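#struct-pred
JK: can someone run the complex with guanosine-5'-diphosphate? inputs below
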Amino acid sequence: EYDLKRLRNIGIAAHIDAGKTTTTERILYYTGRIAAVTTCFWKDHRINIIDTPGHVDFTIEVERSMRVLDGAIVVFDSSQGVEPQSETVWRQAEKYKVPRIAFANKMDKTGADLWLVIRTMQERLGARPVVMQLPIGREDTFSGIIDVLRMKAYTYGNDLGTDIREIPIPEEYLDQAREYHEKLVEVAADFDENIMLKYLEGEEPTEEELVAAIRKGTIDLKITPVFLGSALKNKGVQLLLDAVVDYLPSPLDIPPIKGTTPEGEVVEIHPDPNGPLAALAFKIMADPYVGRLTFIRVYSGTLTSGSYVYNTTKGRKERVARLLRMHANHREEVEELKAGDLGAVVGLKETITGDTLVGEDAPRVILESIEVPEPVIDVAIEPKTKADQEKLSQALARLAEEDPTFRVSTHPETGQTIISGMGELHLEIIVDRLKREFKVDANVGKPQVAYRETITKPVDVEGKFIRQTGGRGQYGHVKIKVEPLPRGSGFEFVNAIVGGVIPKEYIPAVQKGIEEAMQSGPLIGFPVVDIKVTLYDGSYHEVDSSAMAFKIAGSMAIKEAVQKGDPVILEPIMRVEVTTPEEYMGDVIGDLNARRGQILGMEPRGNAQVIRAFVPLAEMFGYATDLRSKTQGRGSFVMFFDHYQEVPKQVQEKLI
Ligand SMILES: Nc1nc2c(ncn2[C@@H]2O[C@H](COP(=O)(O)OP(=O)(O)O)[C@@H](O)[C@H]2O)c(=O)[nH]1
Ligand SMILES: [Mg+2]
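RT: done, structure tokens with the ligand placed:
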């Protein structure tokens, strides 16, 4: 009941509204005649369907979901062929070196041309797609599908899937069918030698030869077999399954994952159920009654239900209580989860999305990197009126655990809770996450940028404090030397008091006091970073001095002594991989250098052209729509924070 050669772990990446969701939903209907990844069966093959992100912008989620799957299907709204975003989604496919096939959906829709896809496929996606099926009909006249591979046709009596009759191709669509059979074998002959020789001598190859050959090609990334249908009208979907088994890869065709030994050495993990074990927990999905199910693709070895696996990313052991394969209607308990297969685990306390798992006495291989995002997008948030402040921070509790990658901070002045993250969308999703499924309605603020502040020249000034007989005598007096530290060298304190000049007891306050003003730079009101303070002189009032009057004695000096060291804003200067069609280069490169950018290289990937840059995050708000407009939607870009840098003189002056 387990042959690695019969699995087929696949995804469904479509432009929104192409039918990512409606194709799957109709894919289960046909499979199930007997939710992250959702196993199922078609002619003696298992087909674990990983879920690919909703919006294809999701990059990181996308990265994962990619890594987790073997084959993949692209769904094209056959109104517009490869859609602008369906164009962008192909980019991701191209990237992660994943074999695939394509689905012309909506052939009933008014606006139903196949060739439209084919043309703008090779034309816009550099695909060299191959035609395997020809419609019988056009719009709402669409009556079937021809398989030019096997030279037969299927018909569809009703818009249901109740009626599918195998019919010999109509005399009408015959001369077209024959031309494309040939033209195809010309692509099969491109892979099999025995096929060419039979094309020439005029011999008909064999269905296997054909399909066998076409498969090497689909797989080895040299084509993209192309079928069509309407998932709405329930036609050609079966074929699409007959496709997947035929062309889409088992976990044995795709290459082994690049895993990293702890010594640095990066070795390759070969799909072997009877060897050391490792897996990837990509999806921490919170079930109802069962609890924290974490979803895992297994690469080597076997997962036994009731065992002790090692969370290699965190470092703590985990116990696998039950092993689940979630199906279309119901769950499933299993004892094994072998290699190349996918599923759900029960237990695993401290295991988050991405964490790698290996088994007890097994090599500690990590599969995912170590990216801890520098916090760059600050967002301010009052509750509704402290009716929703209740379930505000108690809401962050669940959110924090399963995702480490975001600050939470109460802002100095306004006391507004402040959420510090990576990207913009990263933050926006949580608003919908909170103002809806968390029942935390409230007052939101515009994304801000993580400006930090610092000095440049070394200063040397004090910070007294006097409030005598109010209510009992109060007093305290510091004298400090501050100098600027190198970038992202952060804080350093030094105590060079001679002795006795200030009481030993009261230093903590001076420190607690410095630390409290470094949350408010004089330039805007952002955390002062990169500095070296030195307490060296002072005075005290023997009775009047107190833990309060030296917290203030000290705060009054870090505040004051900043506005003297020629203060300076620093800003987040990002790193960008913008994907533009080769035609819009001279156009958007201009866009970067308008946003104080500094272009680095340009290296080709696919029919496209990618460009590495140094735009200030400060100049990035709305860059999506500005590039979607300059590439007519064809563009796409990704950020990866790089460093903090100074702001130029004219940049600062305006910053108030
Ligand atoms: N004409 C036509 N419309 C479809 C078909 N499949 C899906 N749709 C429409 O696609 C829209 C959204 O598709 P959806 O399942 O949400 O795809 P997704 O947005 O990419 O996940 C729905 O409003 C459907 O009516 C099809 O085969 N033919
Ligand atoms: Mg959808």
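RT: quick notes.
Residues 174-188 form the longest helix (15 residues).
DSSP finds 15 helices and 39 strands in the chain.
JK: thanks, will look after standup
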